[PDB]
Design a protein around this ligand. Structure first.
Ligand code: CHL
Ligand code: CLA
Ligand code: CLA
Ligand code: CLA
Ligand code: CLA
Ligand code: CLA
Ligand code: CLA
Ligand code: CLA
Ligand code: CLA
Ligand SMILES: CCCCCCCCCCCCCCCC(=O)OC[C@H](COP(=O)(O)OC[C@@H](O)CO)OC(=O)CCCCCCCCCCCCCCC
Lengths: 742, 41, 215, 207
């Protein structure tokens, strides 16, 4: 076969269908008879494979939808750059980053809100931002508000192009099903074209704009005096005085004999003692390897020249004694089901966001990011939630595939088979591990609480009594310390300062990073992590494996992916559906992530962040109480929650009172969720009966018959507010705390 | 386009209505702030 | 039955300058819509070529002449140097640089737009809207060659089937100019100096000259 | 009285069906399909007519800076800044007075749009009457003394087209003047002269 560009001519464009609500569904396009109609309209709006059964049409819908998504992201980026141009103190912050608070939002003087425009420094009144954009912009060598303004226009223009493309590829030239399926092609391009050229491109701006300008900023020269980026490209003299390797052209690269380029590219590693961020000389070099690597990787798959790989070939040839003919037929499944692809992608993109958070705190990439605790606590916590959510979404679509696309008669797999043929063995074991982890992580805490309360500190699990020293993580930690020179001779300093041992970095009076200690307190929390994660996995995997059938419900697959139950029979069968497993898994992801970000916040303030003076004396924020008081639930209640929540409950009258409002505001919607979660629509519908009576009495009863929320929606509404309330509370709590104290 | 008019007057009618209301309320306040009572009688 | 490089089914040889070369299969007509249609490309190579055919000359003619011709301050700077502001910094002109472009876009706007109409409609352009030349307009059956007369005052092989033996000539030269200009973009970009001026260094001595040498 | 072989704004294109050519000033121009439906169109036609007529009076506003610049006169005050003046009784009062008369003028034309009649009378003297048929062409002595308004199609069309075309031109004009002042902070005519002196460098770009 030969891969090519395939499209079709115009397929309609009119406001006619805008005027017709629920047009996409044949059931709902007839209009409402009850208020249920309205909710269904929004819940089935994006269910494309529920609209039609043609794979070509569904594929064309999701393709333009991605253009729509990108359009928004570009419009969203356009605003952040614009606000950094009109309503910000970036130019002020650019001179004194260590003392001036970054702010990019001014509030109108109505009703008394102007109080939120607090003293952020630089003779500026506004709201302190924790997005981190200031450190990105300084890293890109962005000097003036003009350049941020130009990027704002550039992003807005791109937003228009993205939006235009979506219309063009759904209404004008719609890609054919064969085009979407060319996966050997797409992977080649996304590997080489998007990632390879993308990383290559940024490696260029760095070694021409970022690296030159950043050196000036660090020398201490006034930002307004620093030559524009284009003065470095034109006159190579400027980029020759600093980084003299530029004296030659393509040589030595072209003549190989690498390199005299060690001058602006190196494997130094560690952290810049003056900026607190990763060496820009390393990052530029880093993107150089990433480019080439992905450019190499972009030539694995065979297309139109017989050289490369057929993915279908690779899979089929991977079969063992234990697994059967497994992997055979996976290519046809993954090229035929969107949900199958989305599940894998969510699981992986979500997992990636989580490693990003752990990598950006321990290896601070942007200049003056480490000592801005307000941002670092926000960035880590933000990615933890984003990654956390995306992972739960993988379970949902894995389940949807099982219900909707799974067909043994047409697209058998054998690997997917067998798994279903011992799903009780997998779930029963995962059940056991969770119970073991629960007792052996949380039970240790309850032990500690009881012994402490009985006045038996020596009978506790602690560093001063019965120690549970996490030696495996400690040994590794030590190994990365002895890594440079010994294992990796090219590396000058350690990978991270958490592995440094006897190295510390400070910017201003604040600590950027230092070796992070590990003790019994860290042992207990990690098993708590190991525990909470497994239970989340249990709920979701159980939902996927038993999505189709069960000893209780032989034909669950016929009931669909999202149904309330199958009645009170068989003892009761509420929340048997795969949807309800995602619903239940959502709470447990929340439970797990919440104790993760609390683990972060306390550990950093207690053992890492704090004030340092020029005598070496380090004074941490909470003063190193993590080791002796995080090993007790009462300790978490008192020394963590009670103690640190004082900032947000004492923020009224201050610039941080909005956090005080959102603190209580989020407690409200959280408790509000409990009305929906603890009750059933049977009561509410009967209550509405008495209320409907009153309206009929006064001739003001609506034709659209009011109905209580569906059983599933009641759960959807409940978990949504439980999440919004709980997460927003910690948000207000975190930001108020870290902005006031930090 | 008849039809475009039709997209409108949907729940976009709510937002256009409430945005107008919000504006009116805001201007009133900007004009008469901090009012705890009706003092004209 | 003709010289050819690479493989594709629809490169009949019915198009001028067809060497049957489309490794990317851009002209494959399986799925067509947009700007990926084959005929459009046929028209485009020719337009791009005509313009390129013309431009290459502009790029060097001023260069060359000030060299052995009567050109003073208006001495051709690099082709690149007059128009783009940073290197040469440009030259003043009877009119403001930005303004000319507006006028320039204005004039082109008329000729270019109409040409498109020829492509969207056969004789639409040549039909209606007053003024002479409208008759001039609509000429030909094919947009690529409006068959000016007007565009072709002198039959010039138009009548002879030999016009084919011109088409290709036009086509081959076109690719040639195209290629050329792309060269400048690099030559001028690394070399600085002028494409023609650049030519001499290779000329003064060649061993010394060239890209490897250039580096 | 439709003409389909009429010149179009876009020579190559095809005009929309609603733009019949019967109407005056029809060059088949409604890319957004604003006049897509008959009811909307009638309204739009009336609106354009009014804008055009008002814009033309406004064009005179362009006229005054001419005399003041060279001839002189008491019209020296630029149209811009003209409003904030002390003549007579204060502007606000003037505006209020204006609102009442003109209101009666439309609370006037409006009835005509909605209906076909009301021209039929002078309320005070129910005999003065006056009539012109057709929409925004009231007719009568007050609005059409010379009576050139009443005539024949072809003639009316030609005349009417002239009314609209000048109006469209006038509309751009007025807008152009308003923008012209802000971007240049001067008189329009000055802009005009300046341009002629140096059309080569005197443009939006000059600033
Ligand atoms: C009918 C069209 C009409 C138009 C196009 C304008 C336009 C203008 N007026 Mg008028 N006015 C109009 C009618 C009337 N104005 C006024 C009374 C005023 C005043 C009192 C003022 C204006 C002013 C202005 C200017 C405000 C500039 C601005 O917004 O900058 C952004 C602007 C040129 C202001 C000015 O000084 O303009 C030079 C001003 O002070 N206008 C009255 C009441 C008699 C009008 C009645 O119909
Ligand atoms: C090698 C060239 C190339 C590049 C750079 C891309 C890039 C992208 N693709 Mg495409 N793709 C390609 C080839 C390429 N693709 C080919 C050959 C096929 C056919 C098999 C596909 C089929 C395909 C599908 C089905 C989808 C994508 C999607 C995407 C976007 C993913 C989201 C993102 O990263 O946002 C980042 C945004 C950018 C990096 C801006 C780039 C904008 C253009 C490409 C710049 C190119 C300018 C160039 C210099 C001229 C991304 C823009 C997804 C999408 O989001 O759809 C809109 C999507 O669903 N691609
Ligand atoms: C992101 C892609 C990218 C792009 C578009 C460019 C573009 C350019 N580079 Mg850069 N370069 C890049 C990545 C890139 N480079 C990377 C990753 C490295 C490190 C290996 C370099 C190292 C480099 C050097 C040493 C020089 C350039 C130079 C140039 C300019 C060419 C002038 C010339 O002919 O040389 C003659 C041109 C603007 C030259 C320059 O600065 O212009 C005078 C030059 O001296 N580049
Ligand atoms: C790549 C990301 C991605 C994509 C493309 C999809 C796509 C889809 N999902 Mg999946 N999902 C995802 C991630 C994703 N999901 C994640 C991360 C989770 C874990 C929570 C889920 C869990 C999930 C479930 C349980 C279900 C889906 C379903 C669907 C399908 C229809 C959904 C719909 O109509 O939209 C409708 C959109 C709404 C009704 C918007 C509701 C607003 C939300 C609930 C609250 C937003 C609040 C906001 C964040 C902040 C508050 C602001 C407020 C004050 C204004 C559609 C194929 C449904 C399906 O049946 O599949 C076929 C289904 O039941 N998804
Ligand atoms: C704080 C309240 C709370 C507690 C304690 C639990 C506890 C548990 N949940 Mg539940 N869950 C909760 C809230 C809670 N959940 C809420 C609000 C929801 C709604 C979303 C869920 C939804 C949910 C699901 C879907 C699942 C669980 C599961 C589990 C079990 C996990 C396995 C385990 O750890 O074993 C260990 C038990 C403990 C750690 C409890 C404490 C034990 C104490 C400390 C020691 C014993 C005391 C003493 C010695 C006993 C003798 C006393 C004598 C006088 C009687 C565990 C029993 C999973 C499961 O079934 O397990 C495999 C399961 O799939 N939960
Ligand atoms: C774009 C920014 C902007 C600006 C500069 C203004 C400015 C003004 N507004 Mg507007 N307003 C705006 C946006 C804006 N508004 C928006 C987005 C809305 C909602 C759509 C409104 C809705 C609004 C209303 C309802 C009113 C104003 C009024 C006013 C004027 C106060 C008149 C006075 O003398 O006070 C004192 C008045 C007394 C009676 C004492 C003032 C010129 C007032 C006005 O002039 O009426 C036309 C008025 O009541 N505004
Ligand atoms: C815009 C310039 C241009 C365009 C539109 C075309 C178009 C065409 N060429 Mg031509 N060609 C060109 C320039 C161009 N060529 C140049 C400069 C040369 C000399 C190297 C040739 C040599 C050539 C040969 C030998 C043949 C063709 C042929 C064709 C036809 C089939 C191939 C095709 O459709 O791909 C369409 C091409 C594009 C859409 C342009 C894409 C180019 C991208 C941007 C890459 C640029 C990379 C570069 C380094 C910068 C098609 C009409 C075949 C034919 O049958 O002739 C009629 C034939 O075999 N071409
Ligand atoms: C009313 C709004 C309007 C708009 C947006 C246009 C727009 C256009 N006209 Mg049209 N035109 C109009 C009214 C309009 N016209 C009217 C009322 C008439 C009298 C019948 C014409 C008669 C006319 C003719 C004869 C031509 C156009 C042409 C064009 C196109 C060429 C413009 C150009 O390239 O240079 C930009 C202008 C600058 C000042 C810069 C452009 C699409 C030309 C065309 O179709 O392509 C060549 C063409 O020849 N127009
Ligand atoms: C009784 C209450 C009442 C009210 C509220 C009105 C209101 C109105 N009349 Mg009416 N009228 C009334 C009684 C009333 N009339 C009576 C009893 C008669 C005798 C039968 C008339 C005879 C009459 C005639 C002949 C006309 C009106 C007209 C009007 C409109 C003029 C608008 C205007 O003044 O400029 C703006 C004023 C501002 C303050 C702004 C206005 C809606 C005129 C019209 O055509 O309106 C559509 C008109 O020509 N009225
Ligand atoms: C660090 C986290 C992991 C903790 C380790 C304990 C968790 C074990 C959970 C799964 C155990 C069940 C293994 C049987 C599942 C099974 O039979 O797999 C099949 C596999 C045999 O491979 P095959 O010959 O089938 O390989 C061919 C095809 O499978 C590949 O195309 O055996 C193993 O995976 C050995 C590794 C097990 C250890 C995994 C870790």
């Amino acid at each position: 076969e030969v891969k090519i560009i395939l499209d079709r001519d115009p397929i309609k464009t009119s406001f006619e269908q805008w005027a017709k609500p629920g047009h996409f569904s044949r059931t709902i396009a007839k209009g409402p008879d009850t208020t249920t109609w309205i909710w269904n309209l929004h819940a089935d709006a994006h269910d494309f494979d529920s609209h039609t059964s043609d794979l070509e049409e569904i594929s064309r819908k999701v393709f333009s939808a991605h253009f729509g998504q990108l359009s928004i992201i570009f419009l969203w980026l356009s605003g952040m750059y614009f606000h950094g141009a009109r309503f910000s103190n970036y130019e002020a912050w650019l001179n004194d980053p260590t003392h001036i608070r970054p702010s990019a939002q001014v509030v109108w003087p109505i009703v008394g809100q102007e109080i939120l425009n607090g003293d952020v420094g630089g003779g500026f009144r506004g709201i302190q931002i924790t997005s981190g954009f200031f450190q990105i912009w300084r890293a890109s060598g962005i000097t003036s508000e003009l350049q941020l303004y130009c990027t704002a226009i550039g992003a807005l223009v791109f937003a228009g192009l993205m939006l235009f493309a979506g219309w063009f590829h759904y209404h004008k030239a719609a890609p054919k099903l064969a085009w979407f399926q060319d996966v050997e092609s797409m992977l080649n391009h996304h590997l080489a074209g998007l990632l390879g050229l993308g990383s290559l491109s940024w490696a260029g701006h760095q070694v021409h704009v970022s690296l030159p300008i950043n050196q000036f900023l660090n020398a201490g020269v006034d930002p307004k005096e620093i030559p524009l980026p284009h003065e470095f490209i034109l006159n190579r003299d400027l980029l020759a005085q600093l980084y003299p390797s530029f004296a030659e052209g393509a040589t030595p690269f072209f003549t190989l004999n690498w390199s005299k380029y060690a001058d602006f590219l190196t494997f130094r590693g560690g952290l810049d003692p003056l900026t607190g961020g990763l060496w820009l000389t390393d990052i530029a070099h880093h993107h150089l390897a990433i480019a080439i690597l992905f450019l190499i990787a972009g030539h694995m798959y065979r297309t139109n020249w017989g050289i490369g790989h057929g993915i279908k070939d690779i899979l089929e040839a991977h079969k063992g004694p234990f697994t059967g003919q497994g992997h055979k037929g996976l290519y046809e499944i993954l090229t035929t089901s969107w949900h199958a692809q989305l599940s894998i992608n969510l699981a992986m993109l979500g997992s990636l966001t989580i490693v990003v958070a752990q990598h950006m705190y321990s290896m601070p990439p942007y200049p003056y990011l480490a000592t801005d605790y307000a941002t670092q606590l926000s960035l880590f916590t933000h990615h933890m939630w984003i990654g956390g959510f995306l992972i739960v979404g993988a379970a949902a679509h894995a389940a949807i595939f099982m219900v909707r696309d799974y067909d043994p008669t047409t697209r058998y797999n054998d690997l997917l088979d067998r798994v279903l043929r011992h799903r009780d063995a997998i779930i029963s074991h995962l059940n056991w591990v969770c119970i073991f982890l629960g007792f052996h992580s949380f039970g240790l805490y309850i032990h500690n609480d009881t012994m402490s309360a009985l006045g038996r500190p020596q009978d506790m699990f602690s560093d001063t009594a019965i120690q549970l020293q996490p030696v495996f993580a400690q040994w590794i930690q030590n190994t990365h310390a002895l890594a440079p020179g010994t294992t990796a001779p090219g590396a000058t300093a350690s990978t991270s300062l958490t592995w440094g041992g006897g190295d510390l970095v400070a910017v201003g009076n604040k600590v950027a990073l230092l070796p992070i200690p590990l003790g019994t307190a860290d042992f207990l929390v990690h098993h708590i992590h190991a525990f909470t994660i497994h239970v989340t996995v249990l709920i979701l995997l159980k939902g996927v494996l038993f999505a189709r059938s069960s000893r209780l419900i032989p034909d669950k697959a016929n009931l669909g992916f999202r149904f309330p139950c199958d009645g009170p029979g068989r003892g009761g069968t509420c929340q048997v559906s795969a949807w309800d497993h995602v619903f239940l898994g959502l709470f447990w992801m929340y439970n797990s992530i919440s104790v993760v970000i609390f683990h972060f916040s306390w550990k950093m303030q207690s053992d890492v962040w704090g004030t340092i003076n020029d005598q070496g004396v380090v004074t941490h924020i909470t003063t190193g109480n993590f080791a002796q008081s995080s090993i007790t639930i009462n300790g978490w209640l008192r020394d963590f929650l009670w103690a640190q929540a004082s900032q947000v409950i004492q923020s009224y009258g201050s610039s941080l009172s909005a956090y005080g409002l959102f603190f209580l505001g989020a407690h409200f919607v959280w408790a509000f969720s409990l009305m929906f979660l603890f009750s059933g629509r049977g009561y509410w519908q009967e209550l509405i009966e008495s209320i409907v009576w009153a309206h009929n009495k006064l001739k003001v009863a609506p034709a659209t018959q009011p109905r209580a929320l569906s059983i599933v929606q009641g759960r959807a509404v409940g978990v949504t507010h439980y999440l919004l309330g709980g997460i927003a509370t910690t948000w207000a709590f975190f930001l108020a705390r870290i902005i006031a104290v930090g | 386009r008849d039809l475009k008019t039709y997209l409108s007057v949907a729940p976009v009618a709510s937002t256009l209505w409430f945005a107008a209301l919000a504006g009116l309320l805001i201007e009133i306040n900007r004009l008469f702030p901090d009012a705890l009572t009706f003092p004209f009688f | 039955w003709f010289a050819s490089k690479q493989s594709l089914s629809y490169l009949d040889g019915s198009l001028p300058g067809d060497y049957g070369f489309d490794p990317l299969g851009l002209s494959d007509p399986e799925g067509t819509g947009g700007f990926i249609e084959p005929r459009w490309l046929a028209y485009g190579e020719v337009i791009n070529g005509r313009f390129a055919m013309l431009g290459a000359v502009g790029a060097i003619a001023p260069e060359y002449l000030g060299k052995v011709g009567l050109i003073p301050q208006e001495t051709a700077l690099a082709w690149f140097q007059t128009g783009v502001i940073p290197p040469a910094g440009t030259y003043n002109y009877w009119a403001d640089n930005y303004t000319l472009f507006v006028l320039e876009m204005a004039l082109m706007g008329f000729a270019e737009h109409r040409r498109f109409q020829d492509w969207a409609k056969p004789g639409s352009m040549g039909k209606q809207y007053f003024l002479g030349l409208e008759k001039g307009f609509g000429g030909s059956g094919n947009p690529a060659y409006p068959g000016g007369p007007f565009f072709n005052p002198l039959g010039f092989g138009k009548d002879e089937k030999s016009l084919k033996e011109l088409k290709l000539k036009e086509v081959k030269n076109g690719r040639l100019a195209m290629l050329a200009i792309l060269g400048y973009f690099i030559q001028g970009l690394v070399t600085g100096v002028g494409p023609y001026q650049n030519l001499l260094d290779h000329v003064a001595d060649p061993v010394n000259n060239n890209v490897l040498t250039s580096l | 009285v439709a003409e389909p072989d009429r010149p179009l704004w876009f020579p190559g294109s095809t005009p929309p069906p609603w733009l019949d050519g019967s109407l005056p000033g029809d060059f088949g121009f409604d890319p957004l399909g604003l006049g897509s439906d008959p009811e909307s169109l009638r309204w739009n036609v009336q609106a354009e007519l009014v804008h055009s007529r008002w814009a033309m009076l406004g064009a005179a506003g362009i006229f005054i800076p001419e005399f003041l610049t060279k001839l002189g006169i008491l019209l020296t005050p630029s149209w811009y800044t003209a409003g904030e003046q002390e003549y007579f009784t204060d502007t606000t009062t003037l505006f209020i007075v204006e609102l009442v008369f003109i209101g009666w003028a439309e609370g006037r034309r409006w009835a005509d749009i909605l209906n076909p009649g009301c021209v039929n009378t002078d309320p005070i003297f129910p005999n003065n009457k006056l009539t012109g048929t057709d929409v925004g062409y009231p007719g009568g002595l007050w609005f059409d003394p010379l009576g050139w308004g009443s005539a024949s199609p072809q003639k009316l069309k030609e005349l009417r087209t002239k009314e609209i075309k000048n109006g469209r031109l006038a509309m751009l004009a007025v807008m152009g003047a308003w923008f012209q002042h802000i971007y240049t902070g001067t008189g329009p005519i000055d802009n005009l002269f300046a341009h002629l002196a140096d059309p080569g460098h005197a443009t939006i770009f000059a600033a």
